[PDB]
Amino acid sequence: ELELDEQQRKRLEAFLTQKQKVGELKDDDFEKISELGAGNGGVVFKVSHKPSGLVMARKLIHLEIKPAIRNQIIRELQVLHECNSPYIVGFYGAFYSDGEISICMEHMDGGSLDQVLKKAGRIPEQILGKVSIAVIKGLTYLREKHKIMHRDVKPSNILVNSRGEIKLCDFGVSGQLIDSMANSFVGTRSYMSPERLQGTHYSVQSDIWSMGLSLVEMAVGRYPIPPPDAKELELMFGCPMAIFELLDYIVNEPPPKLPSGVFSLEFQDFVNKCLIKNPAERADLKQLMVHAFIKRSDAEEVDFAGWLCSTIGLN
Ligand SMILES: Nc1ncnc2c1ncn2[C@@H]1O[C@H](COP(=O)(O)OP(=O)(O)OP(O)(O)=S)[C@@H](O)[C@H]1O
Ligand SMILES: [Ca+2]
Ligand SMILES: [Mg+2]
Ligand code: NA
Prior knowledge:
The chain has helices at residues 6-22, 67-77, 113-120, 125-146, 175-181, 204-220, 230-237, 243-252, 265-274, 285-289, 292-299, 304-312; strands at residues 30-38, 42-49, 54-62, 91-97, 100-105, 158-160, 166-168. By secondary structure, the chain is an alpha+beta fold. The chain has 2 domains: 1-109, Phosphorylase Kinase, domain 1 (2-Layer Sandwich), CATH 3.30.200.20; 110-315, Orthogonal Bundle (Transferase(Phosphotransferase), domain 1), CATH 1.10.510. Strands 1-2-3-5-4 form a 5-stranded antiparallel beta sheet, covered by helices on one side. It has a two-stranded antiparallel ribbon with strand order 6-7. A hairpin with a 4-residue loop joins strand 2 and strand 3. Helix 4 packs antiparallel against helix 6 and helix 4 (125-146) packs across helix 11. The longest helix has 22 residues, at 125-146. It binds phosphothiophosphoric acid-adenylate ester, calcium ion, magnesium ion and sodium ion. Residues 39, 156-157, 170 line the site of magnesium ion (MG). Its EC number is 2.7.12.2.
């Protein structure tokens, strides 16, 4: 499942070739085009790398720290230069300047799935079939080629583009950045597995739960916890809990599931196997790769780019 198409292979090749001409990234070499979005930790701008004329997505993390620490983070991020896959957002480089860490990556014109969802209302099962394939393959690539696990799978961390590509981003690679950022910068735990929320076991199985939860949210058009009422579902398809309470609910209540009747039994079974509370019983990457839903989706000819462009008004 890590084999590359001819089109994919050619695209990866082209990306590196361009990346080759870039050189050392410097603060003054960038011109801001617009703000792509913000989160807990930093802001992401669409930028122009003046010298190369290349457009990039520049993530700025404001962190006041000493040269020692800063220089450590920058070193850890260098590993991102090794993560090359059609399912991982391209990396250009990282540097520090004027009290802010910069992470420059490939620009994904379709934005994140959380932004796409807001606009679509809800995402069709067939489209989610392609999203599932991409996430599984992205997690597989990270585990296999880098012995890395994502740790932060969620809709805002799944990027898409007008070329119909779906890629993962923001997978923890720098312990230092996490530490220093663990200060005023702390992301949502609402997609974390029950086991991770209990300081218990935590491997790639944890990422599979996050994916399963993200898929349900996208299919129904709302963060699925707690479960919707027969009345909401009725308005949804015709057919406020505090963070700490939400986390307790996740750990103590049964996992969410898709509503029946509206989705295929195969899709329902797929998410169910991703959402089994017990990580030992929960399906693994290898099993998911051959799941009926995945096999069916893979063989389907879905024009993701077309659906995407018309959905968000791209163009
Ligand atoms: N390469 C990229 N191309 C296009 N848009 C991007 C890219 N990277 C990030 N974005 C957008 O920028 C938004 C903010 O990114 P982040 O700073 O990582 O925050 P977040 O992931 O939304 O939330 P946190 O920080 O994890 S709580 C994302 O949700 C995307 O919409
Ligand atoms: Ca400057
Ligand atoms: Mg992110
Ligand atoms: Na600057």
